[PDB]
Amino acid sequence: NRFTANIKGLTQASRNANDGISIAQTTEGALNEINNNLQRVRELAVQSANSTNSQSDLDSIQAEITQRLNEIDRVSGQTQFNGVKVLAQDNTLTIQVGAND
Amino acid sequence: PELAEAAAKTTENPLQKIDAALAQVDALRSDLGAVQNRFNSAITNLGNTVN
Amino acid sequence: NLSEVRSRIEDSDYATEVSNMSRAQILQQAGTSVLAQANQVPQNVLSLLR
Amino acid sequence: NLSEVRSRIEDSDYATEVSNMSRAQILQQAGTSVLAQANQVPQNVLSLLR
Amino acid sequence: NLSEVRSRIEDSDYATEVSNMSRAQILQQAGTSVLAQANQVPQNVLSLLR
Amino acid sequence: AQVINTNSLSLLTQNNLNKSQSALGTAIERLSSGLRINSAKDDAAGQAIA
Amino acid sequence: AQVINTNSLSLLTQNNLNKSQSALGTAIERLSSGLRINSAKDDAAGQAIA
Amino acid sequence: AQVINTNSLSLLTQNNLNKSQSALGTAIERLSSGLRINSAKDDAAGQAIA
């Protein structure tokens, strides 16, 4: 009987762990998108620095930068695996990876 | 009760700020991606323990 | 990723299910080859003694 | 742009449809190779016992 | 030079990856051709003895 | 303890054949369809979660 | 040691087929995209450095 | 982990082919017209500055 319980727990534990990997991948996609948006912002800042760019240029570059930052606020504010907002708030997700408590 | 507050004045350093954000983000991604290796090794452990 | 997680939950890898079907088939053939013997166990004694 | 939007709605990219056709073909071959076994499951028991 | 160093880190030369895919494919075909035998190993003994 | 009006040896042996038949039925059921959960395969977690 | 209720020979052989499947999956993953590091390919040095 | 009702290996490999298709589309788009910026090529600096 003890072995059957362990086997059931291990398999099920194994079945839940795959889910943890899936959640990590989902977070990574969002994170990758955020990083892509950030790379553009840095390049725009470098372009913006020159004495030469006019203030009518800096208005458009700021419009792009605020749209990119609204987008990395949105894609982290509302993204979810099974109704769980991964990036909106900070907390610990505990994985039961074993039959043991 | 939280909205980005209009900037008081032009940012003194537009880089330093974005290098810090990339470090927080890059660091977070790196931390996240080690947990996938931990879960993969735990799965290959549980397979042989079940067998 | 949602199709991956949903797939694990619903789709079942065969490699274990063909083996489970094979084990149930061998158990069925062994159980039927045993059942006949169980059936004829009593008759030999009764008729032999009678 | 109207042909682009109309195209998405009507035209279907194959790359998923060849895979769906392949999955249905493997399911058909597995279902037929299982069906025969299901057919012969009863006969072994009846004839063996009888 | 930065694209060269970044490229080595991210881009992977295929010449090893096609060979790794081929080795995994031969291991899959050999493992499946072995799995069936493993499946039928027990039935011969049980049915033969029974 | 050699009775023939009810053979107590044959009733249990049959029940085991019936259990093997149900296991073969579920394995054929999941092998043909391609999916582990249909209704009672997993009650709440699988179906609701799925 | 000739058991059929659980075939201890088939479980390990399958696990090896699953490992070969994962290796083929990573090789196809890197061959189609053109890039070795995606997420967990290299944890810290590759991705952070990249 | 050998499922056929949903092939988890083929979905990702396709997405990579779709990404390569979009990259080829932009390169053909800029090679035929002669101009890098059309609309979303560069959002603000290029078009506004241009």
Numbering used by the authors:
A (entry chain A): 51 to 151
B (entry chain A): 405 to 455
C (entry chain F), D (entry chain K), E (entry chain L): 456 to 505
F (entry chain F), G (entry chain L), H (entry chain Q): 1 to 50
Copy text verbatim from the article accompanying this structure deposition.
Salmonella has two flagellin genes, fljB and fliC, and their expression is autonomously regulated to produce either FljB or FliC for filament formation at a frequency of 10−3–10−4 per cell per generation. This is called phase variation, and it is thought to be a mechanism to enable escape from the host immune system by changing flagellar antigenicity. The molecule consists of four domains, D0, D1, D2, and D3, arranged from the inner core to the outer surface of the filament.
We analyzed the structure of the FljB filament by cryoEM single-particle image analysis in one of the two mutant straight forms called the R-type. We used the R-type straight form to utilize the helical symmetry for image analysis as well as to compare the structure with the R-type straight filament formed by FliC. The 3D image of the FljB filament was reconstructed at 3.6 Å resolution from about 1.1 million segment images obtained from 2319 cryoEM movie images. It showed a tubular structure formed by a helical assembly of subunit proteins with an outer diameter of 230 Å and an inner diameter of 20 Å and with a similar helical parameter to the R-type straight filament formed by FliC. The 11 protofilaments could also be recognized as in the FliC filament structure. The missing residues 193–287, corresponding to domain D3, were not built because the resolution of the 3D map was too low to trace the chain. In addition, the density level of domain D3 was much lower than other domains in FljB, indicating that domain D3 was more mobile than other domains of FljB. This indicates that the two-chain hinge connection between domains D2 and D3 was relatively flexible, making domain D3 mobile. When domains D0, D1, and D2 were superimposed between FljB and FliC, domain D3 of FljB was tilted from that of FliC by about 30°, making its position nearly 20 Å higher than that of FliC.
